[PDB]
Scaffold this active site. Structure first.
Site, PDB file in Angstrom:
ATOM      1  CB  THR A 166      -0.930   0.008   1.209  1.00 20.99           C
ATOM      2  OG1 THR A 166      -0.152   0.141   2.404  1.00 20.99           O
ATOM      3  CG2 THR A 166      -1.716  -1.287   1.278  1.00 20.99           C
ATOM      4  CB  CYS A 167       4.256   2.070   1.205  1.00 19.78           C
ATOM      5  SG  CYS A 167       4.058   1.809   2.982  1.00 19.78           S
ATOM      6  CG  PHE A 168       6.252   1.706  -2.842  1.00 16.28           C
ATOM      7  CD1 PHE A 168       6.479   2.942  -2.263  1.00 16.28           C
ATOM      8  CD2 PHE A 168       7.145   0.679  -2.593  1.00 16.28           C
ATOM      9  CE1 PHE A 168       7.577   3.150  -1.454  1.00 16.28           C
ATOM     10  CE2 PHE A 168       8.245   0.880  -1.786  1.00 16.28           C
ATOM     11  CZ  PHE A 168       8.461   2.118  -1.215  1.00 16.28           C
TER      12      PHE A 168
END
Length: 639
Positions: A611-613
């Protein structure tokens, strides 16, 4: 003689050499000692970039052994050097580790390779902005043998740094917070004030576009619900762990291990059973009428919706009357009231909620809410009551949240996979500790906290300051770090919100769902434009746009239902909403980043997410059946 010299002409050959740094500054508790140095050789007159060099040879070490030499041909008459040290592991925070300006004016008698200076002169790091702290010295050597004030802001504007580390500008003139620099001369005759008008009008159509799930002895343990099988059969299943049983779990222990149906997670029937069970007993007034003024919609409401003696009055039908309004009340004025109250409440200006770290369009409870407002308890109970009423009446509430918020609202534990959506740096450091050996960090059980201008030390456990971390105990260390960072900081306010929520709804009726479903239940179910999604999704590591795996994936995505497509979107990007402009503004941890598919893993393994990228790691698959089965299993088991 190796190279890196693009000036020539009438220039002098000079060698710079960095040695190392001693006692570098850091504000990350862990340290995040992953720096890199940028050498910028330029002219002191115009400050135009002439030579740019970057090196990174030290990771996870406070003192970097950067004994690096660079040769360049420039005239020392009017030239200067800039050494800018930054940190690659200080995302969402000021990574400006420091800056040093070196003038080429002293020019001592330098004889490289023909002298024994052994000096390695130390220079103190110099800060560049007030939002930066520098500690330590940088060691440099120079050789030349051969020859022949922040900008002013408009009134009412002020800059703040949230607990994450980013910055945002808040304006008191219109009571609004934003991210970019403060606006220029207002000149708001018609156009500038119409920008806010069209923004509300555009957003208001979005709220009415989303639709609720329905419009698309006696108690049971939480997570257990009844389902009807063909030939007139009734079976009770548990949504806590994938278990299906025939006889009722209550006291019917001997009757177990039967030919129950395969486990299935259906949302429409789940909501149907939920709304079937929820009821209003006893008696209550049949007309809960309220009057509101638009500009004080948040304020006046707090003096009525909270001042109620008992919550049962809330369970009645709602009636709203707006000032200078006499339109019909066919359950639409209440919907607009909910939308407007939600848009006013979920504002960082009041400090109740601040934007998350994995994105920049979601909200989370601010751990520093005590300083901004002295009575966060009462407002959080008010918001809990509003959320409970919204769920009870079946209306839609335009307030989103990150996964750990719902995970705590369901009374579940917290792990690193939860903390990744509250702060990227802590998640990266904790994952590095778990995967690798912590001995390199050499960080003991101490937490450094600065309050009122003075910094002190605290311990997670007694005698913590005298025990160093090692193997076979990093689990409890990371657990206590999680507790100190997220769970314990916001437990009281979250508990107040939960009490306000449960004052209007039974709390045993919510554990039936999971962390991926309450968001859809409260915010409603949206719609996803699959074509625009496809045209705005990059692929890498050999996944061609017409590669068979991508073709099968897009066919499966367009083949799934709306609920499962939404679940996949939520599982990938961590939020069940898309930007109103389109899929081109899908932000990430380190700036905007579109939907991405990655080639990763063994063919017999489930796909992973980041979810960060905003990435989906999908192993290659043979045929359509395998990809559909694996993707469906991953989405149904999105955790």
């Amino acid at each position: 003689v190796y190279g890196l010299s693009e000036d020539e002409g009438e220039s002098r050959i000079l060698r710079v050499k960095v040695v190392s740094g001693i006692d570098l500054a850091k504000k990350d508790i862990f340290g995040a000692s992953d720096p890199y140095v940028k050498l910028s050789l330029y002219v002191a007159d115009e400050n135009r970039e002439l030579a740019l060099v970057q090196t990174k040879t030290i990771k996870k070490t406070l003192n970097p052994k950067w004994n690096e030499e660079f040769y360049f041909r420039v005239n020392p008459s009017n030239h200067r050097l800039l050494f800018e040290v930054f940190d690659e592991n200080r995302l969402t925070r000021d990574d400006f580790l420091g800056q040093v300006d070196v003038p080429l004016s002293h020019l001592p008698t330098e004889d490289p390779t023909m002298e024994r200076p052994y000096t390695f002169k130390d220079f103190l790091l110099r800060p560049r902005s007030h939002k930066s702290r520098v500690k330590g010295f940088l060691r440099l050597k120079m050789a030349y043998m051969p020859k022949n004030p922040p900008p002013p802001l408009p009134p009412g504007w002020e800059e703040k740094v949230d607990n994450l580390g980013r910055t945002y500008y808040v304006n008191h003139n219109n009571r609004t917070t934003q991210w970019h620099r403060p606006s220029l001369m207002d000149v708001s005759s018609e156009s500038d004030n119409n920008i806010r008008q069209i923004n509300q009008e555009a957003a208001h159509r979005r709220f009415r576009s989303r639709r609720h799930i329905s419009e698309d002895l006696g108690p049971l343990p939480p997570g257990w619900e009844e389902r009807i099988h063909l030939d007139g059969r009734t079976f009770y299943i548990d949504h806590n762990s994938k278990i299906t049983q025939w006889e009722d779990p209550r006291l019917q222990n001997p009757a177990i291990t039967g030919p129950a149906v395969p486990y299935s997670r259906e949302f429409k029937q789940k909501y149907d059973y939920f709304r079937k069970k929820l009821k209003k007993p006893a008696d209550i007034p049949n007309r809960f009428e309220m009057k509101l003024h638009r500009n004080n919609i948040f304020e006046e409401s707090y003096r009525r919706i909270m001042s109620v003696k008992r919550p049962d009055v809330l369970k009645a039908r709602l009636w709203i009357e707006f000032e200078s309004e006499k339109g019909l009340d066919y359950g639409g004025v209440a919907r607009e009231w909910f939308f407007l109250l939600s848009k006013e409440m979920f504002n960082p200006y009041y400090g109740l909620f601040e934007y998350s770290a994995t994105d920049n369009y979601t909200l989370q409870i601010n751990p520093n809410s005590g300083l901004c407002n002295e009575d966060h308890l009462s407002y959080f109970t008010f918001i809990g009551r509003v959320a409970g009423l919204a769920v009870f009446h079946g209306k839609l509430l335009d307030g989103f949240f990150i996964r750990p918020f719902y995970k705590m609202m369901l009374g579940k534990q917290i792990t690193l996979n939860d903390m990744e959506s509250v702060d990227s740096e802590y998640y990266n450091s904790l994952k590095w500790i778990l995967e690798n050996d912590p001995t390199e960090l050499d960080l003991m059980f101490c937490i450094d906290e600065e309050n009122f201008g003075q910094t002190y030390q605290v311990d997670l456990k007694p005698n913590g300051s005298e025990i160093m971390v090692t193997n076979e105990n990093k689990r409890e260390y990371i657990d206590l770090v999680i507790q100190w960072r997220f769970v314990n900081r916001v437990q009281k306010q979250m508990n107040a919100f939960l009490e306000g929520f449960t004052e209007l709804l039974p709390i045993d009726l919510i554990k039936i769902f999971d962390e991926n479903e309450l968001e859809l239940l409260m915010c409603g179910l949206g719609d996803v434009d699959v074509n625009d999604w496809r045209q705005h999704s990059i692929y890498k590591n050999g996944y061609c746009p017409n590669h068979p795996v991508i073709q099968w994936f897009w066919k499966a995505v367009l083949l799934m239902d709306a609920e499962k497509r939404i679940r996949l979107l939520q599982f990938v990007t961590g939020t069940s909403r898309v930007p109103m402009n389109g899929f081109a503004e899908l932000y990430g941890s380190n700036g905007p980043q579109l939907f991405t598919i990655e080639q990763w893993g063994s063919p017999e393994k489930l796909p992973r997410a980041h979810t960060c990228f905003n990435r989906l790691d999908l192993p290659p698959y043979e045929t359509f059946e395998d990809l559909r089965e694996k993707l469906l299993m991953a989405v149904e088991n999105a955790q």
